[PDB]
Structure formats: structure tokens, C-alpha cells
Design a protein around this ligand. Structure first.
Ligand SMILES: *Cc1c(COP(=O)(O)O)cnc(C)c1O
Ligand SMILES: *Cc1c(COP(=O)(O)O)cnc(C)c1O
Lengths: 381, 381
């Protein structure tokens, strides 16, 4: 167990247990595997919205080609660990301030999501007397993202008449949390066919395709994860099959890169029965780890049993009960897991929520009810 | 929009991008004056600061209320800037040893105790510090994680009464959230009275105080049909007399009803686009700054400020009389303020004025997701 030595040290020093713990060794091994496996014309970028903690970005920047970013704040964070010319910038509502900032820093690509954005970017580029390499984000045939497939032709033609714009190709991000590697190869096939078709029709060279992220992780069954080696094998073949060896490619994964190496670890403060149902109240809450509520699932956990008793009255101990795990918050929505069968649990024990590395802290309402933040520990050996 | 229009016009005239929380403190004071002055002499109004704990809001509210209701060490600290500890009352299902010791050290007015285990942890701290503490027992009437299951209340009363460091004042009830029915709220209070009197008579301790909770509702669907406060108060006063509660001190602890109608979230339109037949308007900011609509899964009420001028050399994007989905800048399809709502006219550069944004707006939101700059805050006086 990676987190158990840390929990024992915290218990030994009488420190409260409410922590995010990250396995950086596991992260580096995962990254090494991913990046070394790809074909030479495809690179991994990290989509930092999954987890933009500075220590996480620092570890990740050693392996990835660069960062995908979607705001001025994320550009700023990326610039601490990568040069601007390895930062790619997406998002449906890029402000004039963000675009000017991106242009000024010299970001690698801006992924343009609409005609109006193209025109706003262009006006800035004319005012600054600079050029910019772009992709056009395509929404293949409804969400708010990218250019609707049938509108794409018009935005290509507008882009090609702008001398300040260098059109590299296309950007597709149309799927989320896909666990099926064969499906993902078929989706990449579709992206190749559409990009080649627009390139031909509009008579401009297809230099680059951003294939997006959306590679899934399994929170229900932890043993059944995305078949990366299978995917990459069939991906390499597909590139030859479609004659894309000359076209440069990138992925922009968030979740798949960091999910399994993070843990949210908290101590049991209380155990109570209310109208027949058992509850375990934990330190912290869903305002520090909102992932379970966002998904409406029971988040995977293990229990560390603590033998000692810090009080002169007895613990509350139960066994073999359907138990609802909640945090400290004053809302009935503060639930990590609802009516999960628990083998044995007492006040003073520690819950270890696994697979908490992605969209855990990053999506959470940290300061609701003004609780102190959890402590952050990054394991390096 | 009468209140915020002058601000929007100044922001536009000065070339400041519009993404702001705006609060009407004159409206807040008038509202508080009316509520607190209408209560009978034995009832007090506390402000439940989780609704909005912004320092300027607390500054303004502190004049008019008896005190603050708080649910963490952080909220106690924030309350202590404008009230003494003995006008702060402390609730919540997971009060840590650290929070209890801080509450006791500062001398908080009441701790609203939610379990036997908390009672014992509080009592150990009081024996160690040689202090006494006034408490209420939070009752969960006949489920949720909050308070003491009705069946278990007798046992906790008897335990509290034999602990000499504990002063049991009475009971705390908070069941209802967002009730717009004033008559029903009177009937709920009547239940609280009868239950509290029964336990007092059974165990023969003086019924000194009852905390009646918050949960006075606000109408986000129809803004013209708000809680009939004056009706509630008249019947509440009558009920006190009928139930012979004149010598029992009472308190409410309201959040939402106090601050909801005085706050606005206002933001410029960055882009309008059609994606596979569906119209979207993309706003500056996002549901990470104003999560209320997503948390509730409703369409939040708004109005449109129609801005006359154009900063660009190209035409605005405009639509008329379409089902339109309002989204922010975030790179998630869940970033939705309002789904397929009628908009009579809207253009890029217009400002959407989200009304009733004062309670559980900024306070519940995941401020730093995607690392966007915070909205600006303006307090009107
Ligand atoms: C959310 C997002 C990603 C990352 O998605 P994961 O599911 O975390 O891999 C990549 N690109 C874009 C444009 C996104 O919006
Ligand atoms: C949420 C809450 C309140 C305030 O609720 P509103 O609906 O904002 O009035 C008061 N007391 C307790 C114990 C709460 O959890």
C-alpha cells in the first residue's frame, strides 16, 4: 500500500487525517509508458484542467510534449514548466484579453471554436502585426463546443483568406470517459477521413490533427481499465492504413494521465444511525472532493483500521452495515458513497478514496463553509 | 435590472469587461430592518453565513441581526470580525476536536450538538479546559446525516444533564430547505414546540431555548411569488401565545431568504453559435463562478441588457426568438446557466443579468476550476 505509511506517520504525530496524497513514482512510470509507446508523428499533451497542481504539472512536464490549456490562468501555469511554443490553447469563450495574451506569449496553436472567435483573433493579430498557427475545432455530426460540421467549410474559407492566420488543420474532441479502445480507434479513423476530405476540398495542406482526449478510467471496476497497448497497436496500423505518416498528431488527455495516482484520505469523525440508516461522518467533504457528487456514484475506497483510542470513552464501532459516507458539510448532498456495505469501521479509522487524481480537487468548491484546505503530499520514493 | 443598469453602462463606457457580482446593500438593509423588527421580543434572527460569507456582506448584516450561525472554524473566525463569540452559534454534523476547542476557547454562544459522540468529545475538552458550554441538541424528527434520530434523543438528554460542564438549553430543529409555504412553516414550528415541550416535561429540565432553523424559501421560477413573511410572522406570534412559549427564547438561522434577492451575477456575451440545430450563447465567466443553476438543475432567472455599440470592425452575431442555451467559458458540457430558454433578442456584446444570485451563488462555486480570473465584486450603497 502506497498511502499506509503516510497514514501511520500522521496518526503517530497526532496530525489530523484529511489529505490528498499523490504517487509521483507511479505517475512517472505511467507517463514513460504512454509517451514511449506512441508513433513518432504523435505526441501526448496534458490537459491540465484534470489537475493543475504545480507539483503535478512539474512531474508531468518532464514527459509530455506540452500542455493543453483553456484560460489565461492555465497559460500562466503552463508557462512555469513549458515554453509557450509547446502550449496549445482551446475553449469556447476565449476573451480578447486571453487571445492577446496568448498571441503575445507566442503559444503553439490556438484551437479556434467559431467564426466570431476567428474574426476576433484576426483583429488582434492585425493590431499586433503578428501571425498565429491555428486549428479549427470541429463538432462532428449537440454541445456548445467547436464549429458545427456543416458550418466548417465557411470558416475554412474565411481562415484561408486571412494572411495573419496559418491554418494547420483540425481539432476534434467529441467523446468523454471512453473505456473501449476499439471504439476509440474507430473515432480516430473518422477524424482522419473528415480532415483529409476538407483538406482536399479546400486545397490546403493538412499539417496537423489534434485528436483530443477523453480516454476513460473505470471507477466502478478498478481492474478493467482502458486497453492502452491495444489502442496504440491499432492506432499505429490505422495511421499507415490512412497514409497519415506525414501528418503530425496530438492527444490532449487529462483524466487518463492522473486519475489512478491520486488518493483522498480522511478520518472518521462520527458514526450514527438515523431512522434506520447508518452514516459515517468524515473530515473534509465533497467541497474538497466533489467527484462522487458530480458523477452521482459511489466512489471506490478502502478502510485503514486504527487500533488505538485517543479518548477515555469508547469508540463507535460497527460491522457489516450498509453505510453512507458523508463529509462535514451542512447539506444532504455531501455524500461520497450511499448505502455501501462496509465490513468493519470505527470512529478514528481512515477512509482512503482511490482514483482521486483527476477532477477531484480541481472541480471542487474548496471554500464553501470556510473549512481549512486538505494537506497535499507528493510521494517521490 | 433597474439597480444594475447604471453599473453595466459605466463598465461599458470605461471599456471594462463585464463579469461581476453586484450586491444591493441598500436593499439588503431595508430587507433586514423589516424582518428583524417584525419578530416578537422572545425571538431572534441569526444569519447563516454559508449562504454568503463575503466580508462586506457580513459587515452590513451584523448591524441588524442578533448574530451569525456558523458551521466551521473558518466561519467562526469570519463572524468574529463583526460579532463577539457570545453572539455566534455553531452547528454541523462533523465538528472536529480542533473546531470544538477553538469554539470553547473563543467562548461561542451555543454549540448545536448532533450526536452522543460529539457530546462526549465536547465534554472531554471542557473538562480539560475547566470550562462550561451552553448547548442545544439538534433533533432529526420522524433520512439524513444530521442531528440525533428522534428515538435516540432521550438517551442524549440524560447524558447531557449528568455532565456538569454542559448546560442543556433546549433543542435545535432544521429539516426544511427552501419552503415557500408560510402556513406550512407555521405548522412545522408547532411540531417543534410540541416536541421540545414533551422532552422538557419528560426529563424535567427548563426549556430555555429553541432554535427553529432556517429554510425560509426563495422563488427562482416565479419572482413575484416570494415567501409571505408578514403572514408567517402574524401566525407565528399567535402560535407562540397558544402554545405558551412566551418565556422560551427562540431563534431562526436563515441564509437564503436574507441575501438571495439582493445579489446579481452579470456577464457579457462573448459568442453566439448554432451547433446541430441548437443555439448557444457563450458568456464570460461560468458556472464555476455561479454554480447555483447547475447544483439545482434549473434555469436561473435573467434579463438581457441590450448594448447599442460595437467595438469591432465586423458585425455582431445576433439571434431572435430562439430556444437558447446559456453557457460559460468552461470546457465541459455541464457549464450551463440555462437550457433551451426563450430569448427574444440577444447579440454578442450584450449583458446577461442573472437575478437572485446573492445566496449560494459565489459561496458554493468551484472558483478555480480551469483557473479563470475571479469575477469582480461591486457593492452598491
Ligand atoms: C476536457 C477536455 C480534455 C481532457 O479530457 P479528459 O477526459 O480529461 O481526457 C481535452 N481537450 C478538451 C478540448 C477538453 O475540453
Ligand atoms: C443550510 C442551513 C441553514 C440555512 O438554510 P437556508 O435555507 O439558507 O435558510 C440554517 N441552519 C442549518 C443547520 C443549515 O444546515
Amino acid at each position: 500500500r502506497i498511502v499506509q505509511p503516510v497514514i501511520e506517520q500522521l496518526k503517530a504525530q497526532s496530525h489530523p487525517v484529511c489529505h490528498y496524497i499523490y504517487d509521483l513514482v507511479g505517475l512517472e512510470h505511467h507517463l514513460q509508458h504512454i509517451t514511449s509507446s506512441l508513433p513518432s508523428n504523435c505526441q501526448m499533451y496534458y490537459a491540465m484542467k484534470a489537475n493543475s497542481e504545480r507539483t503535478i504539472l512539474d512531474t508531468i512536464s518532464q514527459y509530455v510534449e506540452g500542455f493543453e490549456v483553456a484560460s489565461q490562468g492555465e497559460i500562466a501555469k503552463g508557462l512555469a514548466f513549458k515554453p509557450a511554443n509547446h502550449i496549445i490553447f482551446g475553449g469556447p469563450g476565449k476573451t480578447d484579453e486571453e487571445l492577446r495574451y496568448a498571441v503575445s506569449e507566442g503559444v503553439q496553436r490556438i484551437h479556434v471554436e467559431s467564426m466570431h472567435e476567428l474574426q476576433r483573433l484576426n483583429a488582434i493579430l492585425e493590431d499586433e502585426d503578428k501571425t498565429q498557427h491555428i486549428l479549427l475545432r470541429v463538432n462532428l455530426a449537440p454541445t456548445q463546443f467547436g464549429i458545427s460540421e456543416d458550418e466548417v467549410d465557411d470558416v475554412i474559407e474565411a481562415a484561408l483568406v486571412m494572411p495573419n492566420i496559418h491554418l494547420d488543420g483540425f481539432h476534434f474532441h467529441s467523446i468523454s470517459n471512453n473505456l473501449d479502445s476499439n471504439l476509440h480507434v474507430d473515432v480516430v479513423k473518422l477524424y482522419f477521413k473528415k480532415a483529409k476530405s476538407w483538406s482536399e476540398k479546400h486545397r490546403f495542406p493538412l499539417k496537423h490533427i489534434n485528436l483530443g482526449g477523453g480516454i476513460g478510467v473505470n471507477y466502478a471496476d478498478l481492474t478493467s481499465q482502458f486497453e492502452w497497448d491495444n489502442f496504440v497497436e491499432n492506432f499505429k496500423t490505422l495511421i499507415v492504413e490512412q497514409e497519415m505518416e506525414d501528418v503530425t498528431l496530438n492527444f490532449e488527455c487529462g483524466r487518463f494521465i492522473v486519475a489512478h495516482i491520486g488518493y483522498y484520505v480522511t478520518e472518521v469523525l462520527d458514526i450514527k444511525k438515523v431512522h434506520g440508516a447508518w452514516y459515517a461522518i468524515l473530515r473534509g467533504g465533497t467541497q474538497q472532493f466533489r467527484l462522487p457528487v458530480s458523477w452521482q456514484h459511489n466512489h471506490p475506497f478502502e478502510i485503514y483500521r486504527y487500533k488505538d483510542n485517543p479518548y477515555s470513552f469508547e469508540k463507535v464501532s460497527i460491522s457489516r452495515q450498509d453505510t453512507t459516507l458523508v463529509g462535514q458539510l451542512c447539506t444532504p448532498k455531501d455524500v461520497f458513497a450511499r448505502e455501501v456495505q462496509i465490513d468493519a469501521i470505527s470512529t478514528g479509522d481512515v477512509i482512503v478514496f482511490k482514483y482521486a487524481g483527476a477532477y477531484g480537487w480541481s472541480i471542487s468548491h474548496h471554500d464553501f463553509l470556510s473549512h481549512p484546505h486538505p494537506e497535499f503530499i507528493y510521494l517521490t520514493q
